[PDB]
Amino acid sequence: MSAEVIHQVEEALDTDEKEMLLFLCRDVAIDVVPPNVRDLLDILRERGKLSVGDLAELLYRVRRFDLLKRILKMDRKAVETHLLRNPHLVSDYRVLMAEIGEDLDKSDVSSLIFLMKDYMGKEKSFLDLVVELEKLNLVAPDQLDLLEKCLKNIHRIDLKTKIQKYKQSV
Amino acid sequence: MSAEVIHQVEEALDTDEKEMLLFLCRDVAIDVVPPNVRDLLDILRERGKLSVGDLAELLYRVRRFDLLKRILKMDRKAVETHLLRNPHLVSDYRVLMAEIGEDLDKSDVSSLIFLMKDYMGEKSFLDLVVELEKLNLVAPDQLDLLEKCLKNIHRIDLKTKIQKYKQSVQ
Amino acid sequence: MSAEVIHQVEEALDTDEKEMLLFLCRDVAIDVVPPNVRDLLDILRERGKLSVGDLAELLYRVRRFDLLKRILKMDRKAVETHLLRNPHLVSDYRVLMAEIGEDLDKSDVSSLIFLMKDYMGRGKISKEKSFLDLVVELEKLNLVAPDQLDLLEKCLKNIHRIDLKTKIQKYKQSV
Amino acid sequence: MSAEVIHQVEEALDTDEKEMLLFLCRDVAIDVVPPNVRDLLDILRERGKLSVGDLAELLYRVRRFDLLKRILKMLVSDYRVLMAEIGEDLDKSDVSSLIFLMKDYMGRGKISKEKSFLDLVVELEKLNLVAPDQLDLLEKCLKNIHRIDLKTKIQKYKQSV
Amino acid sequence: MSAEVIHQVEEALDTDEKEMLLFLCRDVAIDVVPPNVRDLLDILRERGKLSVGDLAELLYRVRRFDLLKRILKMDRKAVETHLLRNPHLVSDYRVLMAEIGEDLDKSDVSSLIFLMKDYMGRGKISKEKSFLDLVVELEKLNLVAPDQLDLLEKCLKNIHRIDLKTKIQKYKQSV
Amino acid sequence: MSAEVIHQVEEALDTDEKEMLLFLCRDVAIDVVPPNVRDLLDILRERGKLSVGDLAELLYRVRRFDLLKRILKMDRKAVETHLLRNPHLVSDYRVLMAEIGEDLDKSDVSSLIFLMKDYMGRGKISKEKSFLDLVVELEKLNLVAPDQLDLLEKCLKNIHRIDLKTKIQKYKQSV
Amino acid sequence: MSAEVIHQVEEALDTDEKEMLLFLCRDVAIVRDLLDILRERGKLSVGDLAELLYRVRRFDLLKRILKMDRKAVETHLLRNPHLVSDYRVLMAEIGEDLDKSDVSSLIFLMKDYMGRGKISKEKSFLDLVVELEKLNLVAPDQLDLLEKCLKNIHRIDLKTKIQKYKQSV
Amino acid sequence: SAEVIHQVEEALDTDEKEMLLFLCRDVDVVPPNVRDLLDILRERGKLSVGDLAELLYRVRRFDLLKRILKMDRKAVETHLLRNPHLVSDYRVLMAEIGEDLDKSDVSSLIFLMKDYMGRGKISKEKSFLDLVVELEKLNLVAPDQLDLLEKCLKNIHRIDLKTKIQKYKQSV
Amino acid sequence: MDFSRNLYDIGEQLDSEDLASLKFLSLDYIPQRKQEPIKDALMLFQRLQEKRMLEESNLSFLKELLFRINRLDLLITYLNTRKEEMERELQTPGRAQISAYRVMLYQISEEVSRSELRSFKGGLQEEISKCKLDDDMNLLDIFIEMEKRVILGEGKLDILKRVCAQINKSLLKIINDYEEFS
Amino acid sequence: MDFSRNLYDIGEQLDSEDLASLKFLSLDYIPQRKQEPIKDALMLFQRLQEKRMLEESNLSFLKELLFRINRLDLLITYLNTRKEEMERELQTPGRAQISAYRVMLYQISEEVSRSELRSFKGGLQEEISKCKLDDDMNLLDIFIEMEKRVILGEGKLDILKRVCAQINKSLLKIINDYEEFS
Amino acid sequence: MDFSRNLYDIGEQLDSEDLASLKFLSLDYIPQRKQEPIKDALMLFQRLQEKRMLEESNLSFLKELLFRINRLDLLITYLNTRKEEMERELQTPGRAQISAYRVMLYQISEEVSRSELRSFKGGLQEEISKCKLDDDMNLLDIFIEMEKRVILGEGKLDILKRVCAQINKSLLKIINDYEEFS
């Protein structure tokens, strides 16, 4: 709510969680690309889509529960119930992409980009690669064939199972 | 057409995309020094050179198919058919220069700068290309200097691309 | 309270506060537009509308309490009380426009002028202009008025700023 | 509505295009200096040059095509347009080098205000250091700033006539 | 003293300390607001409130001792002795604000302006302002005073800087 | 105290003790995160929680008595007495975690992160991590707390190590 | 008599250039009306007309009006006696090399000497020279104070030029 | 001349420009850019071909000397020895000391000297020459007294530069 | 542009360790500040070209640098110079642009293995505290650190001899040969 | 999705030792600077692709590399080529893109055991000091080091024969066979 | 975390030799590049989990691996499965996830002594270089090397039979049984 909460949240997070937060909030800011997490939070507050519940949900997606226990004075049960009842902000596709990118180590992404180089043109992370793929209109919540096939080819079948489960859910 | 469309296009673009688009439109605004991409779009509109097809061509040339689908409501196939039928705004020489500039790395461009420091007297490949154009060293009809420099740095794939382009002009 | 007081008040202000003051007082001085702050103060004093209450209201609207305390020797609480009791000289529409102009920055006003250059024209707002200048230009064409604010709300929503739109709707609901 | 269209056109023009139009119409406005485009039209009317065909040619060089279409509702020396093109092709980082290089030729205080290339060309033309048939100083200055492409345009203009 | 010394002092100062010098002299020149250093110094000279001791005090307060040795031909001990036996041209509150303003780095002033961007206009401080500019803006709203410093102390504590808070408390206990 | 002593202290510590100090000083400056030891010490000095006794305690808790002997010219017995009388900067939970991390070799943290791999992911465990990093991750997930140590005790028991479980029980009975 | 020549001369010169012509003829006689009266006095002539254009460094009017470029008049200038003294053209040259960022230093430093009032209007170097000449602080054969001021404003090339002119005559 | 200034200014670095400005601070008004500094020096009459050669030799750019001024090291060195100096020996010594400190050393120096100077006055990511000019402003480093500089340099375990300072002191 | 092409070809054949050796050997003509951002041979070649120590008609310094790191294949292949000519040229007094002390330090650095390096690092704990005993560094960095605190110089060699006497003897032979040349 | 997948599948079956052998065999088309930051076969394939020695319509060099290091299962599975065709193709003069000198060196390097390696290191203490006699150096590193100091050129093989005569005669047989082939 | 604890308990008991046997048996599902850095049971279990061949619900593959390497105490202790049930499950067609080729190769390797291993090596010192025929190599590495040179395939068993005929008959009996099962 107040600027104190935003300042504390900015001070608490590190670089990796900041990048994950930017990726998660990429869709809600449909036309604005923010350079800092501070700018993103200011934009969300100005647009009126930021509240105590929404900020708690965003911090819960990043998996920082001590921040909920300290700043927002909330536990995981309350935010879980709020998700169950109140519709959430980030789509299931974004959190699925984050979950997939969490499991890929620092070496498999190089093999994946080498495989995918034929469709496009240097320490790329999986999140940056999927952002590029979405930019080239190759990966969409309706088009998940390329990612599933490429994950199968590099012999990572648990992630293929995750993608299949997500497709079955919707 | 409407100012809001070009405003959205200007907002969504990235800095590297902005620079590539600014360079790639040098053929049209040959007697204009554009300070910003928004001003470049305004100048193009006021000169009767910008339309739906032209904006689609510009966005397709910088590989932003998501912006074509989301904003201009055009897909890759339709814009490719328009490209095949309607004459291109930008000659293929600028396209070839941009394509080459996207593959060279930091070490390669540094070595190229060291090699080419003899003829002339950090900077990306696009700036080197425009500086070479300034001194009338490389032109769309004469590419011997660039071909020799690309062959001397043991990167012969780009030399193959240049040779294919030079064969295609006849 | 001779012309010395109004001279001090005029000279102490800076450019942006002077522009805000002229925009706020544009309604009362509809007979002649004052090119300078001195002219506006002189014509206000000539008609007799200038007084302790009027000057306190003007200095409180522009948010300059230093001049109010040092020159007029009046506290803000008394100004608020006798402003609630006495009729207001500045319209709520004007203070709303001033607040909206306060909340905007250079990028946002550039976005507004770029979006609305179609109606205004190139030569009218060619130079970089504040939001108050664009508001005056819009009011010249009678597109914005205390009884008609839909276009302003639409333009505000176009630049992705919902809090200002909610403030506009709150003011509309109040009146 | 001959007056309405010309009065409405003046609104869309900006300061840079007004300066460019004044430089282009220097030959037409030799007898009296034009203070503004609105007064420039009055001067042209006094000269009797009020004509749609002659007026539409100016916007072709000014490159403001949308207003040309509005006027169409659907003469000038080629030496001056070469100077206009060269001035428009020079970025703001090279005019400083130009004014520094030719500082000794003219008054240093005469160029105290920041100048566009058109103003510098006018100043050098008042001293007759640049002529339609004499371009050695201009070519040397262009070469010294390391822009050989504009030298090709200068040679093209020289060989054309 | 003469025009030559004023010219030499003006032309030998960078743009960073000119803002400090303008802020420090606001109390003396409050009837009018000066646009630049030369106008301020000339106004003080004409008003008779400028002398060799006043210029020495100003240069000592801006920490430019080399100019004191070169132009004024005085060292630190001489100017300190002169200051000890003469009234101060600048109050202790001003020098305290200036001293605090030099111990804040970019990462702290950015945090302060972000925290206190809600009390004032968002576009009021859109440009990157120094701590001195923020103090001037707060003084305009009559929130910080030579005898009232609670809000400033709380704001300083809000950014996790306690040594400056202790300095404020030391100054308060001094009076 | 001064900057010179901080610089001398920093120049003597190795990497492992630097990481241990960074982990130990988590509670005091929980609002921020310091990149290296020098910045952490600077932050502590700015917050006013740094003194000669505090630095002596921090050096003593990392088992570097030689520096405390020569850099600070202090004795360990005096530090122990000060700890007996003065309040402790770091709670016993942090020193217990540091002791457990010291007692664990390189081949057991891999087993620990494999046992608890269900909650976390491979991305964090791809790089080599010590026990302190795993403790920090568990704390971030709110799985381990100073008043909640059942999970860590069970995990330590599961890997056929009992003495560390005895130490955990000793600490738990200490409160 | 043709007034069209006078009209063309008045129009061709811009406003700032008229001050140079007024300063050049300070001691010759005592805007275009002054030129017309000088023609009546007989001192002004076609040959002397080109001297003003040569001094003011505006060579387009020589071809436009006089129909003779600098090539024809360069020898005549040496042949004809000096209509205007070199002391005035030296001051004109000095004012040519002074920019608007320097006149402020001159007026501020010399405010003590001349009248401190009516300084709101920004004055060129020629105006300051005229003001100094009014108080008899500067003479055609005495340029010591001007040299001192030029040295005080951190400008040495003009200080050497003053000495070169003084030693030349 | 005029073209030589342009050729010199178009073929220099950024830190090299800073060093040139610091060297020219001896000969006043603070120069904003190297172009303005050269214009001021030429207008003041102090600039000369020999002086420009000495200035370029003081910054070790002999290739520029040969390419522009058509002179070698021996000729310019003999000219400098015979003719009076333009830059004082103290400035050259300061520049030479500054050229021999890497990023860690200057970071340690600014951290040490931040004790009695404003945190925002020096801020971070600044060169040694900026610290030297700050000390000059504070009037504690002078061509006759360098005790504080020597002590601070010794605090960071750099004794070769201390020997350099001692040798300079012995020279005069 | 055949000269620049030749220099580029020479620079492409040098890995990181040889680049570090070249950087250490050229400390006389290149200060630390100009040397820190160097991470490729092209930057070093350009820095040398700025001081006019390397051009079309003057390649002697480059030949000496390549000779001192035993890269004779680059000498014969590109610069067209064999070992005998370089030995004869360097035997002539006044043709050595690199001081023999630096070459001696480099040769001592080459003749030390990993265990010998660790013993060398541990042998300095008797006289210097942990402040200058950074074990992460290599032998060249240790020599530079010793040079910084004027505990090891052209005229000061007692510490170096004392440390060398602990590990090997041929190093003492090299030091004695250098002293004989002095 | 087809060619890149095949290249990745081929590269997934090469361990560290085979990667080192491939890096050694390709020194004529990849300089030392590019050789240094390579740790998996994908980067080597990228380097070969940049020089246009490996693409969809040209697979000769990859087949030659895979046959030279004695990996025939990969050829018969992921590339569909038998031993006889490769042998006949390589026997044709003018088609072998790898010089026979490097092949001979690699074949020699495959015929040395640990005791033989230590004997080889001991025999090379004259021309090469103990610096390059590290116990972690393999025979290929020794060969590269000798090639650096122009003692093991394509026309200069006397030192190799002299060293090998003290270990086994099969190596001399291999060298003599190569020389007879010339 | 019962499943992970069970896997850790199982992996605690395995020694180096059983780890090598498991690595050999799991070649068809793990490439060589992933095989090289494997050093304990936990890494192998992670690799098996990554391919979804081992999880909470599915444990057939782990039981098959434990049965093949003849470790029944672990099966009866930490997995609650007996020998007869495992044999009955394996005899069902389609349940075995390891081909009979690998099983028979491992069984052959289990029945070779050091003298018989030396005889096997001497019988095959002609087609295989001495680099892979060192005394440290066991029979599994020899089999892998022979598979690498396409001299020992699923349908190609001439060399294996010829070598085994010179050592023992029971190995030929096992080969004949495998051929009969085919």
Short characterization:
Chain D: It comes from Homo sapiens (Human). By secondary structure, chain A is mainly alpha-helical.
How many β-strands of chain I, per DSSP? 0
Listing every helix as H and every strand as E from the N terminus to the C terminus, the arrangement of chain I reads HHHHHHHHHHHH
Rg of chain I, rounded, reads: 18 Å
Q: Estimate nothing, just give the exact number of structural domains of chain A.
A: 2
| C-alpha-based Rg of chain A, rounded | 17 Å
Which range best describes the helical content of chain A: under 10%, 10-25%, 25-40%, 40-55%, 55-70% or over 70%? 55-70%
What's the overall geometry of chain A? Answer: globular
CATH topology of the largest domain in chain I: Death Domain, Fas
CATH architectural group of the largest domain in chain A: Orthogonal Bundle
The CATH architecture name of the largest domain in chain I reads Orthogonal Bundle
Secondary structure: helix percent of chain I: 55-70%
Name the CATH homologous superfamily of the largest domain in chain I. Answer: Death Domain, Fas
Task: Characterize the largest beta sheet of chain A: strand count, sense, and whether it forms a barrel.
Answer: none
Name the beta content range of chain A.
under 5%
Return the structural class of chain I.
mainly alpha
Q: How many helices of chain A in DSSP terms?
A: 11
Oligomer: hetero-oligomer of 11 chains
- CATH class of the largest domain in chain A equals Mainly Alpha
Topology pattern of chain A, helix = H, strand = E:
HHHHHHHHHHH
The N- to C-terminal Cα distance of chain I equals 43 Å
What proportion of the residues of chain I form beta strands (DSSP E)?
A: under 5%
PDB class: apoptosis
Keywords: fadd, caspase-8, cellular FLICE-like inhibitory protein, Death effector domain, apoptosis
Assembly: undecameric
Entry title: Structure of the Caspase-8/cFLIP death effector domain assembly
